[PDB]
């Protein structure tokens, strides 16, 4: 139906220098 695993996907975007 769905996936989390596209939120944490993000979250590794998140960590940017």
């Given at each position: 139906?769905?996936?989390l695993f596209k939120k944490?996907?993000?979250l590794?975007?998140?960590k940017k220098f």
């Open positions: 139906k769905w996936k944490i996907k993000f590794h975007s998140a």
